[PDB]
Paper text:
The archaellum (or the archaeal flagellum) is a specialized organelle that enables cell motility in archaea, serving as the functional equivalent of its bacterial counterpart. Like archaellins in other species, the Hbt. salinarum archaellin is tadpole-shaped, consisting of a 45 residue-long N-terminal α-helix and a C-terminal globular domain organized into an eight-stranded anti-parallel β-sandwich.
The structure of the Hbt. salinarum archaellum filament was determined from archaella isolated from 4 M NaCl-containing medium and diluted into 1 M NaCl-containing buffer. The twist and helical rise were refined to values very close to the initial values, yielding a map at an average resolution of 3.4 Å. Moreover, those regions unique to each archaellin face the solution and hence do not participate in inter-molecular interactions, preventing the prediction of their arrangement based on surface complementarity. Indeed, we could fit three sugars of the N-linked tetrasaccharide (the composition of which was previously defined using NMR and MS)26,27 known to decorate Hbt. salinarum archaellins at the N80 glycosylation site and two to three sugars at the N93 site (depending on the subunit), with no density being observed for the fourth sugar at either position, probably due to the flexibility of the glycan moiety, which projects beyond the protein surface of the filament. However, the density extending from N93 protrudes from the protein surface, with no interactions between the attached tetrasaccharide and amino acids of adjacent archaellins being seen. In summary, given their distances and how they point away from inter-archaellin surfaces, the N-linked glycans decorating archaellins that comprise the Hbt. salinarum archaellum do not seem to play a significant role in promoting or supporting interactions between archaellins within an archaellum filament.
Residue numbers in the entry:
A (entry chain Q): 13 to 193
B (entry chain R): 50 to 115, 118 to 193
C (entry chain P), D (entry chain I), E (entry chain H), G (entry chain K), H (entry chain M), I (entry chain C): 13 to 49
F (entry chain T): 146 to 193
J (entry chain P): 98 to 117, 120 to 145
């Protein structure tokens, strides 16, 4: 009589113990994938970053109309897709955020275009050697940049790494085809 | 509990920047560009609240939909489909809060403390320090 | 029958710790290679 | 159960290091523009 | 998990030092051409 | 384990997310969130 | 009558676990306030 | 009864962290005076 | 319970960093006064 | 790559072998073995 009661309850103990084991392991399984992902993206936030070689600009009449930045893959970074990066423009006039546009040259408006300089891809920095030129149109994001102005460009990659550049038009553009912003 | 406890820690909002528009001589808007933190699931900005600790006021802004903002905040998207929910790592939204409406028009040097509170409780903090010289600036960088 | 329950749960703890231990080591290994480069 | 606690703290530790890494780089980026100017 | 954090921050220090080194060399290069002329 | 992505759904594009729970006969479940690399520019094979 | 004994011990086990859960969080509550300060 | 086991283990890492906390601060204490002098 | 161990170490880590800041400032303070004279 | 900003154009030159060069540059070896890679401190490449 007493043994019969022990048998049925013993099954209950085994089933309950298996239930508790399931809760622990599956929860640990969820956290492992969440934890593993965070380490990769957070390291991606710090490592994948854009370095700006130099920023020159074509000169029309007597005011800069283009702001071309030569950007390169930073030190120890993975692929940097520029077509998914945003550029913030805080200048003497407007205060917008420029997103990528598939070809425009002169019709960039409130966007930016990336023409390749060195490499295979024309929007994806792969190796250290590859350099990409970012095309931004001055007299369409605001107005043609005047003599001795300033622009606050923060090229932000998709992973959050910000590269701040301060373009400064030369104080005088007397008979210059292009300057070094 | 395991999912939400991880959610409380994981889904966080990182503030890319904060630029305010300048009218006459006062930062009348305060725009915040937010992004998903490292390894964060879908963050909904509609069910989020912002605490405004400023010089003259101290309230907690909530969400709204479309100049006529007052004691709320509105989110206009910048990159990536939806205009209230962060889905991928590459999406950005702008948080609009009419500064002269939630209190008085922000003057030079006046600092504002913000705490964007996600739905699951994760908090981010920002100290927007208005430049102490607004003379002849179309838009500043708080 | 209290002893039976402990034995099964004990196996879960060792597995859970191994899962948590593995996550840290591989994550550091990724950061080690990333940092060295 | 101890393995569970390690993972949640591990996520926070990575996030804080990312936050600290942000301040160092952004401030350096700001000074670089000011310094070259 | 303190080892996890120090890896990420270590990367930040290296990048910041390269940023500061970049400003120094570039400014010296500018003045050298200005000085030589 | 061989699995045809272009037959269970579609050819996994960039940034795609697939969640797998390999469950043995007895019931034990192993979860693995496969993460397609963010950009597939010039990669013959990748590490999901 | 084995089931009857099973139930009473089960009641105590839930109460005992509640004590340990209480101590852990309340102690963590103190260090949280101390750590923030 | 698993709560009782947690309590003893709970007490352990309060002391262990305090032991780890103490050595870290004191080793900074020696470096404090040496650097200033 | 791993959180409890983390919190105590966090307090020590903050205090140690404060000490290092103190010596780095005060020694810079003395050198300024010696430099000015 | 070498950046040219003259009185007229402001382009970015890249290496195109065998020339005498449109918008490219060539590297002859003044002193050394390799004519495109500076290996030691003594090599001079034009
Ligand atoms: C920033 O980076 C962008 C990257 O695109 C760069 O863009 C270029 O800017 C040029 C200019 O400075 O505005 C543009 O120039 C024009 O187009 C050229 C080409 O067709 O792309 C050239 O075109 C020929 O010009 C002759 C000439 O007699 O005027 C004309 O017959 C005719 O327009 C074209 O004839 S063609 O060559 O047979 O096709 C010419 O520029 S040039 O080559 O420098 O002489 C311009 O008309 C260029 O298109 C544009 O992509 C910005 O300059 C940077 O600031
Ligand atoms: C680097 O980062 C850039 C950022 O822009 C990224 O660029 C995009 O890549 C997308 C994709 O290749 O990943 C391109 O997506 C396009 O739209 C897709 C979808 O409609 O959203 C796909 O569209 C196909 O269009 C065909 C066509 O006959 O019309 C249709 O059959 C159908 O709508 C789609 O079929 S599909 O191709 O078999 O899926 C398609 O991309 S795909 O699904 O990956 O194949 C694209 O047309 C997007 O245009 C592009 O800017 C780069 O990919 C990154 O490397
Ligand atoms: C050396 O230093 C001199 C300092 O004078 C500098 O050249 C001068 O710069 C002035 C200015 O740009 O700082 C030029 O001012 C001109 O007049 C302005 C104003 O009217 O007083 C502006 O005039 C524009 O004219 C247009 C036109 O269509 O008539 C009108 O739309 C409107 O009146 C003005 O529009 S605007 O250009 O968008 O402002 C204009 O200067 S501005 O306001 O800065 O734009 C100039 O025409 C002055 O002519 C110029 O010589 C040199 O450049 C330095 O090298
Ligand atoms: C913070 O972030 C918020 C995000 O919304 C941003 O808000 C915008 O700021 C603009 C400006 O103040 O910078 C506002 O611009 C005005 O409204 C626009 C639109 O109606 O929303 C435009 O409106 C037309 O402007 C013409 C023009 O001749 O002035 C007028 O006839 C009339 O006001 C409007 O006519 S319409 O187009 O036929 O409707 C115009 O801006 S524009 O589109 O950039 O040219 C402005 O009048 C904008 O409304 C506002 O949401 C803040 O600026 C950031 O600080
Ligand atoms: C982030 O959080 C936001 C929070 O708003 C969420 O966005 C949306 O929130 C809406 C709401 O505020 O909850 C949801 O609205 C949906 O549509 C409403 C309306 O039609 O516009 C409501 O629709 C019901 O539909 C039934 C149905 O039988 O058709 C009708 O009886 C009637 O139209 C509505 O009845 S109701 O549900 O009893 O009200 C309803 O919302 S409600 O009125 O608040 O109840 C919703 O179906 C919307 O779905 C939601 O997306 C974002 O999605 C989050 O990411």
């Amino acid at each position: 009589q007493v043994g019969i009661g022990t048998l049925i309850v013993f099954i209950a103990m085994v089933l309950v113990a298996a239930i508790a084991a399931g809760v622990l392991i599956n929860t640990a399984g969820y956290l492992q994938s969440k934890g593993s992902a965070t380490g990769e993206e957070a390291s991606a936030q710090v490592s994948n970053r854009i370095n700006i070689v130099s920023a020159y600009g074509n000169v029309x009449x007597x005011x800069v109309d283009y702001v071309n930045l030569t950007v390169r893959q930073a030190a120890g970074a993975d692929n940097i897709n520029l077509x998914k990066s945003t550029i913030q423009w805080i200048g003497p006039d407007x205060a917008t955020t420029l997103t990528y546009x598939x070809x425009x040259x002169x019709x960039x408006x409130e966007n930016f275009t990336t023409x390749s300089i060195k490499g295979x891809x024309x929007x994806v920095l792969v190796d250290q050697s590859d350099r990409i030129k970012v095309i931004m149109y001055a007299x369409x994001v605001x107005x043609x940049l005047x003599x001795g102005x300033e622009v606050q460009l923060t090229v932000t990659t998709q992973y959050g790494s910000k590269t701040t550049y301060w373009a400064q038009v030369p104080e005088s553009l007397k008979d210059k085809n292009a300057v070094x912003l």
